[PDB]
């Protein structure tokens, strides 16, 4: 029953934003919601960048993600940043 209270929109692209982007594309706020919904040991990440590599969606299909940045500067504004 751990859930964020406030929500803001991202301003400038960063590593943190890249990863929020990847979670939200798959239908999750962030890693916290992801681990609530699914039983997760660890999240698959790309070794060099730490970026999310693969996520399982709610319908049990999988999204895969590139080794390098995917969040287009245009898309940055659409990344939601949650409070606590």
- Could you tell me the smallest distance in angstroms from the CB atom of residue 32 to another protein? 4
Q: Measuring CA to CA, how many Å separate 2 from each of 66, 68, 72, 81?
A: 30, 31, 30, 16
- Could you tell me the smallest distance in angstroms from the CB atom of residue 83 to another protein? 7
- Could you tell me the smallest distance in angstroms from the CB atom of residue 55 to another protein? 14
Report if residue 32 touches another protein, rule: CB under 8 A. Answer: yes
Among 36, 70, 75, 76, binds another protein (CB under 8 A): 36
Q: Measuring CA to CA, how many Å separate 40 from each of 45, 49, 56, 69, 83?
A: 13, 20, 10, 24, 22
Which pair of structure tokens corresponds to residue 11? 């301003």
User: Where along the sequence are the contacts to another protein (CB under 8 A)?
Assistant: 1-2, 30-32, 35-36, 42-43, 50, 83-84
């Amino acid at each position: 029953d751990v859930k964020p209270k406030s929500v803001s929109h991202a301003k400038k692209w960063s590593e943190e934003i890249e990863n929020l982007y990847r979670f939200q594309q798959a239908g999750y706020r962030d890693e916290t919601e992801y681990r609530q919904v699914k039983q997760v040991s660890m999240v698959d990440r790309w070794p060099e960048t730490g970026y999310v590599k693969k996520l399982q969606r709610r319908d049990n299909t999988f999204y895969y993600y590139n080794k390098q940045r995917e969040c287009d500067d245009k898309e940055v504004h659409k990344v939601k940043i949650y409070a606590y």
